[PDB]
């Protein structure tokens, strides 16, 4: 298939493996999650514009909006973590081992 889809899928996998390998910050995790969403937006958009499927042109906007609301919720969770420990470090979130 087309050549641009290779790069958009590879971008989704790069943002996947960034989201699946945390370093320290939860904000960097949320950025990798939104990179995954952005690559999904681009890939859906290039397909729907290519196929001239008219009714799905409203589809990526929807894919934006919900997920950005999702991002808002994630930011709020991070802030609550930051209001407990002072930092958004993922190693502070280890109390549920016992």
């Amino acid at each position: 298939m087309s050549l641009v889809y290779m790069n958009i899928m590879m971008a989704f996998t790069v943002s996947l493996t960034g989201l699946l390998m945390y370093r320290s910050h939860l904000m960097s995790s949320l950025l990798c999650l939104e990179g995954m969403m952005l690559s999904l937006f681009i890939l859906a958009t290039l397909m729907i514009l290519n196929s001239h499927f008219t009714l799905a042109s409203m589809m990526p906007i929807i894919l934006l909006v919900f997920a950005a609301c999702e991002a808002a919720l994630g930011l709020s969770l991070l802030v609550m973590v930051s209001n407990t420990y002072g930092t958004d470090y993922v190693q502070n979130l280890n109390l549920l081992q016992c």
Binding site: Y22, V90, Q97
Partner: protein, 55 residues
Amino acid sequence: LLDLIWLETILPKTISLAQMKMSTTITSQKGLIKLYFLSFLITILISTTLLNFHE
């Protein structure tokens, strides 16, 4: 020797110690979100490259 030790050793005590040991391996996690998602990425890589669950 037999009906207090060895017939007691081979079927119930070895199985009970094995399930105890596997239970202590599974639940010895450090609560780190980093390690669980790193295991998820290793899972996806083993599933695609090593187990071929996408073919």
